[PDB]
Amino acid sequence: ELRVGLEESELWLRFKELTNEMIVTKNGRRMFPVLKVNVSGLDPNAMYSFLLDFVAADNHRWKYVNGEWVPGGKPEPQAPSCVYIHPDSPNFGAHWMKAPVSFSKVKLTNKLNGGGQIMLNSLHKYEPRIHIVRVGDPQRMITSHCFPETQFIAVTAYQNEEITALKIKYNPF
Numbered sequence: 001e002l003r004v005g006l007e008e009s010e011l012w013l014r015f016k017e018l019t020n021e022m023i024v025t026k027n028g029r030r031m032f033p034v035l036k037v038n039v040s041g042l043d044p045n046a047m048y049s050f051l052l053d054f055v056a057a058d059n060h061r062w063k064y065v066n067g068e069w070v071p072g073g074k075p076e077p078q079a080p081s082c083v084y085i086h087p088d089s090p091n092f093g094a095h096w097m098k099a100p101v102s103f104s105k106v107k108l109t110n111k112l113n114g115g116g117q118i119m120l121n122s123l124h125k126y127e128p129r130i131h132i133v134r135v136g137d138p139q140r141m142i143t144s145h146c147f148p149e150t151q152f153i154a155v156t157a158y159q160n161e162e163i164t165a166l167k168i169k170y171n172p173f
């Protein structure tokens with residue numbers, strides 16, 4: 001049976017319990033922690049592509065005041081994000097199951113869109129969404145999934161100082 005598990009789920013939870021933040025800049029910043037998944041249960045001989053996009057967890061604008069994240073009261077419809085393709089796509093199931101599938105190269109921006117960069121709306125909450133699509137045979141969506149531990153708020157600068165401490169501790173950047 002299909003099984004797609006989040007690697008380093010405990011560190012992701014460490015960030016989630018404080019409300020995770022990801023820096024968005026004009027040219028882009030890589031995510032931390034890195035989105036990595038362990039995959040099993042695919043057809044080892046079928047052809048698949050791994051895609052990544054970002055879905056807004058809600059339509060509100062968030063702000064960090066008095067040490068707490070709070071939403072606004074004037075939500076807006078959100079535009080669909082650009083779709084990032086894993087550089088190993090397309091590939092066989094045996095390749096995707098051999099080792100963790102890492103999305104370390106994607107860069108989150110507030111402007112530049114495409115070629116590895118994905119533009120997000122600042123101060124909005126997002127979930128990364130992984131898509132496994134079968135490319136051969138009858139092409140079909142195998143799965144589309146968001147891991148709740150990977151939820152984050154896009155920021156132009158870190159607001160929670162505990163988040164800054166965590167990023168410095170576990171990411172050399």
Ligand SMILES: *[C@H](CC(=O)Nc1cc(C(=O)Nc2ccc(F)c(Cl)c2)ccc1OC)CN(C)C
Nearest residue numbers: 051081082083084113114115118131133140141
């Ligand atoms: C975004 C660049 C971009 O998104 N390029 C791109 C997207 C797709 C795509 O939407 N694939 C897809 C979506 C949903 C789904 F269910 C399936 Cl099966 C496939 C395909 C190909 C692409 O580029 C080649 C920035 N741009 C400026 C909007």
